[PDB]
Amino acid sequence: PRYLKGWLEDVVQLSLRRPSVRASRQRPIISLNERILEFNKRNITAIIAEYKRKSPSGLDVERDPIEYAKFMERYAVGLSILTEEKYFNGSYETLRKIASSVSIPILMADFIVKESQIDDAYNLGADTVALIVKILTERELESLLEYARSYGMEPLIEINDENDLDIALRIGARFIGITSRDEETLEINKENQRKLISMIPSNVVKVAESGISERNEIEELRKLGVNAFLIGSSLMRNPEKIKELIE
Ligand SMILES: [Zn+2]
């Protein structure tokens, strides 16, 4: 991985030593990016609802994961499950139990730095994974993208700046998340997020991530070409909000 500082350096070293799991997957992969495009053709707002108990930006809640997932199943285009343990209080069991309980596509969100974490996502039932450009070298990113595709996944390649975007397009990403949060500093910049969105080709499936709480922002981003919206904190604190956000 890259040489980082602060909490990201810590989470990367933790991830390198993450013990892998063993299990026989039950259901074939179902595509999150393809379901997003189907929602777009149906003119249904496509929200990826995220389950996370804690975050470095101060979220700290307890909520039953299965009850949350079963509620979201009616409304969300997919789910994102945090599996990072130290900063997000996620776990592999959380992913396994949620995947075993819903039929919509599931994204495992963690700090993937080694192939066995993709093995873990597959064996636990996830349909895809996030790969974060700013924690990986270009060579690692290309290799992990190919590895995930060899299972039948289309990973969400996450970008925050123009250097990240250059890499993501160069390596052939087809499913890009544009996060407004710089994970190193926790700073939110929506202007920069909109700039990057405008630089992505129309045939790439685009997901806006971080800081979304209001239907007005979803509408404005949809007008700019965003295909789907990854929303965590606001839904973890008031799950029923997704109903208003999709209206
Ligand atoms: Zn993300």
Domains, the chain: 6-15+31-246 (3.20.20.70)
Tokens at 47, concatenated:
């929200």
Report the separation in Å between the CA atom of 101 and the middle of ligand 1, taken as the mean of its atom positions. Answer: 23
At how many Å resolution was this determined? 1.5
Report the separation in Å between the CA atom of 109 and the middle of ligand 1, taken as the mean of its atom positions. Answer: 7
CA 5 to chain centre: 22
Q: Do residues 158 and 132 make contact, with C-beta atoms less than 8 angstroms apart? A: yes
Q: Nearest-5° angle of CA 182, CA 188, CA 189? A: 100
* Of 51, 29, 33, the residue nearest 206 (C-alpha): 33
Tokens at 116, concatenated:
């066995």
Report the separation in Å between the CA atom of 158 and the middle of ligand 1, taken as the mean of its atom positions. Answer: 6
Query: CB count, 10 Å around CB of 141?
Result: 23
Task: Tell me how far apart the alpha carbons of residues 198 and 104 are, in angstroms, rounded to a whole number.
Answer: 29
Give the CA distances from residue 217 to residues 1, 47, 115, 176, 224, in Å, rounded to whole numbers and listed in that order: 34, 13, 36, 19, 11
Task: Tell me how far apart the alpha carbons of residues 238 and 44 are, in angstroms, rounded to a whole number.
Answer: 21
3-state class (DSSP) for residue 47: strand
β-pairing, 47-51 vs 106-109, is unpaired
Neighbours of ion ligand 1 (CB under 5 A): 158, 209
Report the separation in Å between the CA atom of 131 and the middle of ligand 1, taken as the mean of its atom positions. Answer: 8
Report the separation in Å between the CA atom of 54 and the middle of ligand 1, taken as the mean of its atom positions. Answer: 14
Q: Do residues 229 and 221 make contact, with C-beta atoms less than 8 angstroms apart? A: yes
Report the separation in Å between the CA atom of 25 and the middle of ligand 1, taken as the mean of its atom positions. Answer: 24
Task: Tell me how far apart the alpha carbons of residues 159 and 176 are, in angstroms, rounded to a whole number.
Answer: 7
Report the separation in Å between the CA atom of 132 and the middle of ligand 1, taken as the mean of its atom positions. Answer: 7
The residues, any chain, with a CB within 8 Å of residue 75's CB and separated by 6 or more, are: 47, 49, 242, 243, 246
Task: Tell me how far apart the alpha carbons of residues 89 and 186 are, in angstroms, rounded to a whole number.
Answer: 18
Q: Do residues 138 and 167 make contact, with C-beta atoms less than 8 angstroms apart? A: yes
CA 74 to chain centre: 19
Give the CA distances from residue 68 to residues 49, 102, 175, 240, in Å, rounded to whole numbers and listed in that order: 9, 11, 26, 10
Q: Give residue 122's region: left, alpha or beta (phi > 0; psi -120 to 50).
A: alpha
Q: Do residues 37 and 138 make contact, with C-beta atoms less than 8 angstroms apart? A: no
